[PDB]
Write a protein that binds this ligand. Structure first.
Ligand code: HEM
Ligand SMILES: [O-][O-]
Ligand SMILES: [Cl-]
Length: 153
């Protein structure tokens, strides 16, 4: 469980993400695909983006990052009360996209990296710990929904 103060730290840095959702999403995916190359293999339409400049220029990838971060931000703003928002994401990611929970951990690492790179002054130790707890809760709850649907993530 997160305290209310921890949720406030999560939502304080998230407001900074919201000043440029597209750019944060690009940086997150570029970091994810470089750090854990197996993850790019899940994205059929991004595999031909073979250099960083191609990834940054891709409208398709840019729009995808906004879709991802918007869903995550909506979940974070529920402060744990997120079953209704989480279920469709578990449904598609378990049954259509086939994303292991470990890949959600990889994406979480990239999120934390970009947040700290862009906002170090608003992403100190307490805020990092809060975001780690929030993203763990998200992943734990997704993992339970995966199993309820019959998918071992
Ligand atoms: C914070 C974690 C994540 C969130 C919030 C998230 C959210 C979303 C959302 C909202 C969509 C569009 C609707 C849907 O199909 O569900 C989506 C699509 C998708 N996601 Fe995720 N996602 C996450 C992590 C991942 C990871 C780690 C991968 C793969 C390595 C992945 C692969 C996909 C794919 C392949 C699609 C379909 C994209 C398309 O064809 O346009 N996602 N995601
Ligand atoms: O990728 O969601
Ligand atoms: Cl939440």
């Amino acid at each position: 469980v997160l305290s209310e103060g921890e949720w406030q730290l999560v939502l304080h840095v998230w407001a900074k993400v919201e000043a440029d959702v597209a750019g944060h999403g690009q940086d997150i995916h570029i970091r994810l695909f470089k750090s854990h190359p197996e993850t790019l293999e899940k994205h059929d339409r991004f595999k031909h983006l073979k250099t960083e400049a191609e990834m940054k220029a891709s409208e398709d990838l840019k729009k995808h990052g906004v879709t991802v971060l918007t869903a995550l931000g909506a979940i974070l703003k529920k402060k744990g009360h997120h079953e209704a928002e989480l279920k469709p994401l578990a449904q598609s990611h378990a049954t259509k996209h086939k994303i292991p929970i470990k890949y959600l951990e990889f994406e979480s690492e990239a999120i934390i990296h970009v947040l700290h790179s862009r906002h170090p002054g608003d992403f100190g130790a307490d805020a990092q710990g809060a975001m780690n707890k929030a993203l763990e809760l998200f992943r734990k709850d997704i993992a339970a929904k995966y199993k309820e649907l019959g998918y071992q993530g």
